[PDB]
């Protein structure tokens with residue numbers, strides 16, 4: 001915890017909860033929270049949202065700790081949508097502070113126990129909007145002495161219809177336009193319109209906000225039409241004076257394809273079953289413009305000097321992903337965007353996702 005001003009006492013209590021270092025949401029918000037800045041945080045479940053406000057709030061409060069006076073008003077108000085979530089936030093506070101009085105006020109429980117806690121004095125108050133609004137009406141609860149307000153799981157509170165109850169509580173604790181109002185920490189995962197209306201009505205003018213080359217095409221094609229569609233994509237992306245390299249896994253398929261009526265007239269084959277003398281000649285032919293289509297096998301190309309192309313075609317999702325990405329970087333001539341086409345069948349659909357994941361690319365599925 002070296003980067004942060006967390007006391008040795010708090011560090012020891014934190015190790016009991018299995019906290020030895022801060023999660024990203026915590027490290028990013030700590031100083032905004034500690035320094036008293038207003039904040040809107042967007043974070044998913046399990047990211048450690050509770051400690052991102054609890055740890056810096058407890059540290060700030062511990063540093064300004066004035067004698068525990070009976071009947072004291074809360075300094076912190078945490079609004080939570082449910083009893084279950086309010087009890088977890090309370091426990092999280094209680095487990096890392098042995099100096100501050102932590103109260104949990106939810107509805108559908110006797111008022112007596114809560115009135116007693118209010119008389120003894122509260123430092124940190126966690127509660128559901130209903131019960132907090134009740135004790136405001138009673139007069140018994142004083143929320144005009146607040147330094148900090150946390151609106152936890154805002155989305156859930158809105159989905160449950162607590163918008164108007166929260167706005168009522170906010171109207172008591174906040175003065176419209178005051179730069180002296182409590183510090184507001186808003187926790188909304190999706191940030192609906194209500195969040196930005198609350199921010200411009202109750203929050204400070206300035207607030208922090210924290211969140212948490214080649215075209216690759218994939219064509220679904222039945223093997224019986226592949227050669228016809230190959231002729232069509234060449235016509236479109238390569239055309240006249242163009243260069244296309246087709247990659248076929250088997251030496252048979254590559255030979256069969258270079259001889260297919262759709263491309264045969266402008267194509268030449270290249271594989272392991274062709275002499276080194278024929279290979280250097282076909283490479284010269286491709287490089288000088290004797291033919292525009294070079295049909296090859298993924299392995300029989302590995303160390304070969306292939307010129308810049310306009311279009312790369314894989315007959316099926318490649319096994320050899322590094323050969324695919326290397327050849328992809330040599331596509332696109334005269335400032336035109338390079339095009340890599342990948343043909344696939346329904347059985348090869350997850351294979352496409354594997355290529356996407358290994359290569360760090362996303363295919364346009366057509």
Ligand SMILES: Nc1ncnc2c1ncn2[C@@H]1O[C@H](COP(=O)(O)O)[C@@H](O)[C@H]1O
Nearest residue numbers: 018019021022023045046047048049050
């Ligand atoms: N820095 C941390 N190290 C270890 N566990 C943590 C840390 N921050 C939060 N947690 C735990 O992660 C879980 C999810 O946190 P939360 O989303 O706040 O409920 C809880 O069980 C926390 O106790």
